[PDB]
């Protein structure tokens, strides 16, 4: 129980009632530092722990694909916590109003939440802080090393973050203690009803193809804590060996496929790292994978935490802003609208195939995501419009979207964040370029195109 994982958001007078874990980013019962710390505080206070989750008014900004994935997981999660005699309460509405009222109505003693560096979570925290008078803590349950501990500032390159993060692994990479149940069960609607009404409100915006059939295929990723663990186990046993060599080949399914579970916190990345470390396979594949789930994932939290404008042009490095500004008035070879990008109606079949994989499976292959976002920059009127188009499509259709990895990955692609300068080109400037011919030299683009008609 390392105290460096928990931060005080507001000191107050501890009440004589239950400790409330405001679950948000880490929707799992196992390997959850936020829930474990909440249980430890409740034990010291001779009081039980409860879990509250807020179903917010912003689910209508995404799709059925993300809403169902999350709620099906929460249905399984409610059963798991019940076995630990830990009740879960699901509120519908604004977390500022709903959690303030819950704290007062249930006489909460202490409030705990998990850590997310996203703007919308900071918005909720501000409203909640002004509506309560009990202590308020946040716990980094998503990163192996607490975000505010790994670095005290924005890191501009992976190679300046990698030694810092690795130097702290011996202290923060540790096993998880078992979640102890409440001593006795203590003293707002069913999840299937909230799922039905939510789906009914999202249906007019469901992504469809010409014959009114739904585009999304929900059988690619089963949601939930139990399914995440099987995905992790299959990756280590069947795919980890070839990951180093085939991670950039979109015609092979050699990625871990963990990002939807990681995004919703249905599995702990620290759990994955522990299991990968103790697995014996190709050391280069182990190094490459750990680089992605440790360095690149946690530097994305670092990017959003230390850059208030992480989703804006202003957070790009100066060399990239000056380069993109110098080519603002370059004639673009193509300009597509948001609707043409969305439907996959560009002149590029590779880009079109990547958009179709996004539309059908909700998870674009990691390599084509780089090509996909860089062409948006190339075929947009300005870098600002490219940012907004890329964020729109990513957050609307990616199961792992609305995520620090998304804004950091898009800022890498369009603005060179966590990248370096390359040869100067028109339109794109010194931003790393990815040509259609370059992709043909790295994988069989025809198979990828044919797979997503
Ligand atoms: C334009 C763009 C948008 C992206 N949007 C998202 C997003 O919305 N959500 C998201 O989780 N990732 C995003 N990424 C990062 C990355 O593409 C995906 O995480 C990766 O493809 C996820 O599939 P996987 O779990 O099977 O990958 P794996 O290859 O098995 O890697 C495992 C984990 O390492 C992390 N990781 C891998 N690559 C990156 C990266 N470039 N940056 C940060 N973390 C990484 C992820 O957590 C990933 O789950 C984006 C990248 C780009 C270039």
mmCIF file of C-alpha atoms in Angstrom, residues 15-201:
data_model
loop_
_atom_site.group_PDB
_atom_site.id
_atom_site.type_symbol
_atom_site.label_atom_id
_atom_site.label_comp_id
_atom_site.label_asym_id
_atom_site.label_seq_id
_atom_site.Cartn_x
_atom_site.Cartn_y
_atom_site.Cartn_z
ATOM 1 C CA UNK A 15 -17.985 11.675 8.772
ATOM 2 C CA UNK A 16 -19.061 8.605 10.719
ATOM 3 C CA UNK A 17 -20.528 6.802 7.706
ATOM 4 C CA UNK A 18 -19.284 4.579 4.900
ATOM 5 C CA UNK A 19 -16.289 5.246 2.685
ATOM 6 C CA UNK A 20 -17.453 5.928 -0.874
ATOM 7 C CA UNK A 21 -15.339 4.896 -3.863
ATOM 8 C CA UNK A 22 -16.442 7.089 -6.780
ATOM 9 C CA UNK A 23 -15.506 4.659 -9.542
ATOM 10 C CA UNK A 24 -14.906 6.276 -12.930
ATOM 11 C CA UNK A 25 -11.892 5.151 -14.962
ATOM 12 C CA UNK A 26 -11.117 1.760 -13.369
ATOM 13 C CA UNK A 27 -14.238 -0.388 -13.704
ATOM 14 C CA UNK A 28 -13.005 -3.621 -12.144
ATOM 15 C CA UNK A 29 -13.023 -5.344 -8.761
ATOM 16 C CA UNK A 30 -9.568 -6.963 -8.913
ATOM 17 C CA UNK A 31 -6.186 -5.222 -9.089
ATOM 18 C CA UNK A 32 -7.750 -1.828 -8.287
ATOM 19 C CA UNK A 33 -5.602 0.389 -6.058
ATOM 20 C CA UNK A 34 -8.453 2.897 -5.703
ATOM 21 C CA UNK A 35 -10.846 0.238 -4.396
ATOM 22 C CA UNK A 36 -8.138 -1.348 -2.227
ATOM 23 C CA UNK A 37 -7.211 1.980 -0.630
ATOM 24 C CA UNK A 38 -10.913 2.693 -0.088
ATOM 25 C CA UNK A 39 -11.254 -0.652 1.697
ATOM 26 C CA UNK A 40 -8.204 0.097 3.857
ATOM 27 C CA UNK A 41 -9.567 3.484 4.939
ATOM 28 C CA UNK A 42 -12.973 1.949 5.687
ATOM 29 C CA UNK A 43 -11.374 -0.748 7.853
ATOM 30 C CA UNK A 44 -9.395 1.821 9.855
ATOM 31 C CA UNK A 45 -12.632 3.761 10.442
ATOM 32 C CA UNK A 46 -14.664 0.681 11.506
ATOM 33 C CA UNK A 47 -17.039 1.387 8.626
ATOM 34 C CA UNK A 48 -17.915 -0.351 5.319
ATOM 35 C CA UNK A 49 -16.933 0.662 1.795
ATOM 36 C CA UNK A 50 -19.422 1.302 -1.006
ATOM 37 C CA UNK A 51 -18.968 1.908 -4.733
ATOM 38 C CA UNK A 52 -20.831 4.553 -6.744
ATOM 39 C CA UNK A 53 -20.724 4.951 -10.522
ATOM 40 C CA UNK A 54 -22.315 7.869 -12.371
ATOM 41 C CA UNK A 55 -23.988 7.306 -15.741
ATOM 42 C CA UNK A 56 -23.483 10.797 -17.128
ATOM 43 C CA UNK A 57 -25.366 12.900 -19.700
ATOM 44 C CA UNK A 58 -22.472 12.566 -22.199
ATOM 45 C CA UNK A 59 -23.031 8.973 -23.334
ATOM 46 C CA UNK A 60 -25.110 10.435 -26.169
ATOM 47 C CA UNK A 61 -21.853 11.889 -27.541
ATOM 48 C CA UNK A 62 -20.619 8.381 -28.401
ATOM 49 C CA UNK A 63 -22.354 5.287 -29.786
ATOM 50 C CA UNK A 64 -24.111 2.091 -28.798
ATOM 51 C CA UNK A 65 -20.797 0.273 -29.294
ATOM 52 C CA UNK A 66 -19.158 1.971 -26.287
ATOM 53 C CA UNK A 67 -22.329 2.244 -24.186
ATOM 54 C CA UNK A 68 -23.102 -1.484 -24.356
ATOM 55 C CA UNK A 69 -19.468 -2.509 -23.814
ATOM 56 C CA UNK A 70 -19.278 -0.426 -20.638
ATOM 57 C CA UNK A 71 -22.674 -1.361 -19.202
ATOM 58 C CA UNK A 72 -22.321 -5.094 -19.847
ATOM 59 C CA UNK A 73 -19.048 -4.876 -17.937
ATOM 60 C CA UNK A 74 -20.741 -3.004 -15.099
ATOM 61 C CA UNK A 75 -23.421 -5.712 -14.937
ATOM 62 C CA UNK A 76 -20.697 -8.305 -14.353
ATOM 63 C CA UNK A 77 -18.909 -5.936 -11.957
ATOM 64 C CA UNK A 78 -22.027 -5.498 -9.806
ATOM 65 C CA UNK A 79 -22.086 -9.271 -9.269
ATOM 66 C CA UNK A 80 -18.385 -9.459 -8.361
ATOM 67 C CA UNK A 81 -18.589 -6.692 -5.753
ATOM 68 C CA UNK A 82 -21.738 -8.293 -4.322
ATOM 69 C CA UNK A 83 -19.706 -11.426 -3.582
ATOM 70 C CA UNK A 84 -17.376 -9.212 -1.523
ATOM 71 C CA UNK A 85 -20.455 -7.803 0.285
ATOM 72 C CA UNK A 86 -19.625 -4.454 -1.367
ATOM 73 C CA UNK A 87 -22.791 -2.716 -2.633
ATOM 74 C CA UNK A 88 -22.634 -0.692 -5.835
ATOM 75 C CA UNK A 89 -24.865 2.300 -6.571
ATOM 76 C CA UNK A 90 -25.444 3.527 -10.124
ATOM 77 C CA UNK A 91 -26.541 7.153 -10.417
ATOM 78 C CA UNK A 92 -27.847 8.820 -13.573
ATOM 79 C CA UNK A 93 -26.996 12.460 -14.151
ATOM 80 C CA UNK A 94 -24.387 15.090 -13.417
ATOM 81 C CA UNK A 95 -21.662 13.813 -11.041
ATOM 82 C CA UNK A 96 -21.511 17.262 -9.448
ATOM 83 C CA UNK A 97 -25.138 17.054 -8.327
ATOM 84 C CA UNK A 98 -25.559 13.288 -7.927
ATOM 85 C CA UNK A 99 -22.433 12.571 -5.877
ATOM 86 C CA UNK A 100 -22.921 15.618 -3.657
ATOM 87 C CA UNK A 101 -26.435 14.412 -2.839
ATOM 88 C CA UNK A 102 -25.285 10.813 -2.307
ATOM 89 C CA UNK A 103 -22.538 11.941 0.089
ATOM 90 C CA UNK A 104 -25.108 13.861 2.140
ATOM 91 C CA UNK A 105 -28.002 11.394 1.835
ATOM 92 C CA UNK A 106 -25.854 8.399 2.836
ATOM 93 C CA UNK A 107 -23.751 10.268 5.443
ATOM 94 C CA UNK A 108 -20.497 9.329 3.734
ATOM 95 C CA UNK A 109 -17.374 9.588 5.867
ATOM 96 C CA UNK A 110 -14.750 9.811 3.120
ATOM 97 C CA UNK A 111 -14.871 10.110 -0.676
ATOM 98 C CA UNK A 112 -12.355 8.361 -2.946
ATOM 99 C CA UNK A 113 -12.102 8.393 -6.743
ATOM 100 C CA UNK A 114 -9.657 7.056 -9.295
ATOM 101 C CA UNK A 115 -7.379 9.241 -11.402
ATOM 102 C CA UNK A 116 -8.061 10.459 -14.927
ATOM 103 C CA UNK A 117 -6.223 13.461 -16.428
ATOM 104 C CA UNK A 118 -9.074 14.235 -18.844
ATOM 105 C CA UNK A 119 -10.781 17.620 -18.850
ATOM 106 C CA UNK A 120 -14.279 16.232 -18.283
ATOM 107 C CA UNK A 121 -13.096 14.493 -15.096
ATOM 108 C CA UNK A 122 -11.518 17.704 -13.796
ATOM 109 C CA UNK A 123 -14.862 19.365 -14.529
ATOM 110 C CA UNK A 124 -16.639 16.802 -12.337
ATOM 111 C CA UNK A 125 -14.047 17.112 -9.559
ATOM 112 C CA UNK A 126 -14.538 20.885 -9.384
ATOM 113 C CA UNK A 127 -18.320 20.614 -9.053
ATOM 114 C CA UNK A 128 -18.044 17.856 -6.432
ATOM 115 C CA UNK A 129 -15.426 19.652 -4.307
ATOM 116 C CA UNK A 130 -17.691 22.680 -3.846
ATOM 117 C CA UNK A 131 -20.598 20.466 -2.761
ATOM 118 C CA UNK A 132 -19.044 18.322 -0.021
ATOM 119 C CA UNK A 133 -17.257 18.881 3.284
ATOM 120 C CA UNK A 134 -15.682 15.439 3.871
ATOM 121 C CA UNK A 135 -12.109 14.450 2.903
ATOM 122 C CA UNK A 136 -11.615 13.730 -0.797
ATOM 123 C CA UNK A 137 -8.784 11.557 -2.139
ATOM 124 C CA UNK A 138 -7.835 10.373 -5.613
ATOM 125 C CA UNK A 139 -5.782 7.256 -6.359
ATOM 126 C CA UNK A 140 -3.866 6.484 -9.547
ATOM 127 C CA UNK A 141 -5.203 2.988 -10.226
ATOM 128 C CA UNK A 142 -4.516 3.133 -13.989
ATOM 129 C CA UNK A 143 -0.736 3.655 -14.203
ATOM 130 C CA UNK A 144 1.943 1.383 -12.767
ATOM 131 C CA UNK A 145 3.778 4.476 -11.483
ATOM 132 C CA UNK A 146 1.552 7.335 -10.231
ATOM 133 C CA UNK A 147 1.333 9.956 -12.969
ATOM 134 C CA UNK A 148 2.444 12.780 -10.667
ATOM 135 C CA UNK A 149 5.389 10.634 -9.480
ATOM 136 C CA UNK A 150 6.792 9.340 -12.782
ATOM 137 C CA UNK A 151 7.576 12.918 -13.824
ATOM 138 C CA UNK A 152 6.936 16.426 -12.507
ATOM 139 C CA UNK A 153 6.545 17.955 -15.978
ATOM 140 C CA UNK A 154 5.619 17.286 -19.582
ATOM 141 C CA UNK A 155 8.044 14.865 -21.236
ATOM 142 C CA UNK A 156 8.807 15.693 -24.853
ATOM 143 C CA UNK A 157 10.206 12.308 -25.931
ATOM 144 C CA UNK A 158 9.880 8.638 -25.058
ATOM 145 C CA UNK A 159 13.640 8.471 -24.465
ATOM 146 C CA UNK A 160 13.423 11.171 -21.778
ATOM 147 C CA UNK A 161 10.488 9.408 -20.086
ATOM 148 C CA UNK A 162 11.736 5.815 -20.424
ATOM 149 C CA UNK A 163 14.642 6.004 -17.912
ATOM 150 C CA UNK A 164 12.540 7.896 -15.359
ATOM 151 C CA UNK A 165 9.682 5.385 -15.532
ATOM 152 C CA UNK A 166 11.986 2.348 -15.489
ATOM 153 C CA UNK A 167 13.949 3.683 -12.501
ATOM 154 C CA UNK A 168 10.717 3.603 -10.461
ATOM 155 C CA UNK A 169 9.452 0.186 -11.632
ATOM 156 C CA UNK A 170 11.295 -1.625 -8.775
ATOM 157 C CA UNK A 171 9.208 0.349 -6.264
ATOM 158 C CA UNK A 172 5.791 0.460 -7.946
ATOM 159 C CA UNK A 173 5.677 -2.817 -9.928
ATOM 160 C CA UNK A 174 4.347 -5.097 -7.201
ATOM 161 C CA UNK A 175 1.699 -7.733 -6.638
ATOM 162 C CA UNK A 176 -1.817 -6.773 -5.646
ATOM 163 C CA UNK A 177 -3.253 -7.638 -2.227
ATOM 164 C CA UNK A 178 -6.588 -9.405 -2.112
ATOM 165 C CA UNK A 179 -9.690 -7.255 -1.718
ATOM 166 C CA UNK A 180 -11.115 -7.995 1.721
ATOM 167 C CA UNK A 181 -14.926 -8.143 1.947
ATOM 168 C CA UNK A 182 -16.974 -5.855 4.136
ATOM 169 C CA UNK A 183 -17.649 -7.287 7.587
ATOM 170 C CA UNK A 184 -21.445 -7.003 7.262
ATOM 171 C CA UNK A 185 -23.557 -5.733 4.379
ATOM 172 C CA UNK A 186 -24.510 -2.086 5.069
ATOM 173 C CA UNK A 187 -27.748 -0.193 4.414
ATOM 174 C CA UNK A 188 -30.576 4.407 -8.625
ATOM 175 C CA UNK A 189 -32.184 1.748 -10.822
ATOM 176 C CA UNK A 190 -31.343 -1.599 -12.373
ATOM 177 C CA UNK A 191 -28.658 -1.609 -15.048
ATOM 178 C CA UNK A 192 -30.706 -3.423 -17.704
ATOM 179 C CA UNK A 193 -33.346 -0.674 -17.670
ATOM 180 C CA UNK A 194 -30.748 2.101 -17.970
ATOM 181 C CA UNK A 195 -29.191 0.118 -20.825
ATOM 182 C CA UNK A 196 -32.529 -0.234 -22.639
ATOM 183 C CA UNK A 197 -33.458 3.452 -22.430
ATOM 184 C CA UNK A 198 -29.907 4.470 -23.336
ATOM 185 C CA UNK A 199 -29.867 2.247 -26.424
ATOM 186 C CA UNK A 200 -33.257 3.603 -27.486
ATOM 187 C CA UNK A 201 -31.923 7.170 -27.314
#
